[PDB]
Amino acid sequence: NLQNIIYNPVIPFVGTIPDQLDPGTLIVIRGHVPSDADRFQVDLQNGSSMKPRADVAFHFNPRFKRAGCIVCNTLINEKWGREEITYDTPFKREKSFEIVIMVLKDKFQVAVNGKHTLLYGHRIGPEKIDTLGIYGKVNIHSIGFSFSS
Amino acid sequence: LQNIIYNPVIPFVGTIPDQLDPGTLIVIRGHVPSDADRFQVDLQNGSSMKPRADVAFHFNPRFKRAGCIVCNTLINEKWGREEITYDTPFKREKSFEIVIMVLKDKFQVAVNGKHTLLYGHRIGPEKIDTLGIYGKVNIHSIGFSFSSD
Ligand SMILES: C#CCO[C@@H]1[C@@H](OCc2nc3ccc(C(=O)O)cc3n2C)[C@@H](O)[C@@H](CO)O[C@@H]1Sc1ccc(Cl)c(Cl)c1
Ligand SMILES: C#CCO[C@@H]1[C@@H](OCc2nc3ccc(C(=O)O)cc3n2C)[C@@H](O)[C@@H](CO)O[C@@H]1Sc1ccc(Cl)c(Cl)c1
Ligand SMILES: [Cl-]
């Protein structure tokens, strides 16, 4: 029942999100981490411009060096805010994943492979998000949505 | 614990010890007395009484008739356009939890876990340094979760 399901997008991927990220909306991203990956990111953006760079309401950034981590942040007017670093990370080079981002009224709730991973409080209203960016060293098998509208 | 106060005498005026950066939460728990006419939560630029400090965000439940919430901004001792919410969760002799979420372009307010209203910034939130609570209300606690922490 997912909506706007696409497969194997070319990376970097920048796509217009097909409906509003109302509370209850899911973004479902399946993929895998390449063996030489250093990092990738999933960015929920207000616009697609590269100059001035579009605000990033939610930057979800797995990093694989050393024991690995996930960094989350927001870009406002081309400046990053406070990093929220999650050291309990489910991602691994060579492991496939399913990311589910649930939009709540006050935060995002992210699960990976059916298990809760992290929360991230809103800094930009989620109604301003209209673009999904996926960048870095990653293969994305599929993207789909479950809209709450 | 430096960012919470319990059972403040009303009127309460306190300096906010960090910036209301996007992502910051203000959580106010309390109870409305049986004879209340109104109370207000004011996010202020300073604490001056003469001349009266600007109020970036005046959040003002009123109990007469069917009740409402009035929101407004005071700049140089002049009130702007009132934003009136008729769907109000406040009642005499009822408890509440207010959550004010500071976003890039607005405040988002939820009471008792239910969305209540939005209020677009009219004064930059970086100018807010003081919280006031006035009127007929009992406050159990005020807490801040700063997005810089
Ligand atoms: C690496 C690096 C440097 O920059 C990253 C940010 O990444 C920017 C970014 N956007 C991209 C889009 C596409 C691609 C691509 O490969 O196509 C690569 C991209 N990179 C690296 C971000 O992760 C950001 C998250 O906080 O962290 C740093 S900046 C930074 C540093 C310290 C602090 Cl304390 C704070 Cl707050 C912030
Ligand atoms: C009642 C009353 C009159 O004034 C309020 C404002 O409240 C001022 C105020 N500040 C206080 C601080 C402390 C205490 C206390 O009891 O300790 C009481 C306070 N009061 C009443 C405001 O609610 C303001 C919000 O718009 O509305 C009115 S003015 C007004 C009238 C019409 C229009 Cl159309 C427009 Cl735009 C504006
Ligand atoms: Cl916003």
Residue numbers in the entry:
A (entry chain B): 7 to 155
B (entry chain A): 8 to 156
Task: Give verbatim lines from the article.
Galectin-8 is a tandem-repeat galectin consisting of two distinct carbohydrate recognition domains and is a potential drug target. Like other galectin CRDs, Gal-8N is ~130 amino acid β-sandwich that contains a galectin-defining amino acid motif coordinating conserved binding of galactose via hydrogen bonds to OH 4 and 6, and ring oxygen, and hydrophobic interaction with H 3, 4 and 512. Furthermore, ligands generally bind to the N-terminal domain (Gal-8N) with substantially higher affinity than to the C-terminal domain (Gal-8C). Since the expression of the Gal-8 gene LGALS8 is much more amplified in a variety of tumours compared with Gal-1 and Gal-3, possibly its most important function remains its role in cancer, particularly in angiogenesis and lymphangiogenesis, and inhibiting these processes by a Gal-8 inhibitor seems a plausible therapeutic option.
The alkynyl moiety of the 2-O-propargyl moiety leans directly towards the Arg45 guanidinium group with a distance between the terminal propargyl carbon atom and the terminal Arg45 nitrogen atom of 3.2 Å and 3.4 Å in the two independent copies. However, an even more important answer that could explain the increase in binding enthalpy comes from the structural analysis of 11 in complex with Gal-8N, where a contact between the 2-O-propargyl moiety and a guanidine moiety of Arg45 is observed. This contact is similar to, but not the same as a contact we observed between d-galactal ethylene and the guanidine of Arg45 and may be rationalized by non-canonical cation-π interactions. Alkyne-cation interactions have been reported several times in synthetic chemistry, but to our knowledge no such interactions have been found between a ligand and a protein, which is why we have labelled them “non-canonical cation-π interactions”. These were studied with quantum mechanical calculations which indicate that the LUMO of Arg45 of Gal-8N (depicted in blue) points towards the HOMO electrons of propargyl alkyne (depicted in red) of compound 11, but without evident HOMO-LUMO overlap, meaning that the covalent nature of this interaction is negligible. Yet, the distance between the guanidine C-atom and the terminal C-atom of the alkyne is 3.3 Å, which is in line with a distance threshold for classical cation-π interactions, as these occur within a distance of 6 Å31. The observed interaction is unique and may account for the enthalpy-driven increase in the affinity of 11 for Gal-8N. Surprisingly, the comparison of thermodynamic parameters between 11 and 1 shows an unexpected gain in enthalpic contribution with a further loss in binding entropy compared to 29 (11 vs 1: ΔΔH = –17 kJ mol−1, TΔΔS = +14 kJ mol−1, 11 vs 29: ΔΔH = –4 kJ mol−1, TΔΔS = +6 kJ mol−1), suggesting that contributions other than classical hydrophobic interactions govern the binding of 11.
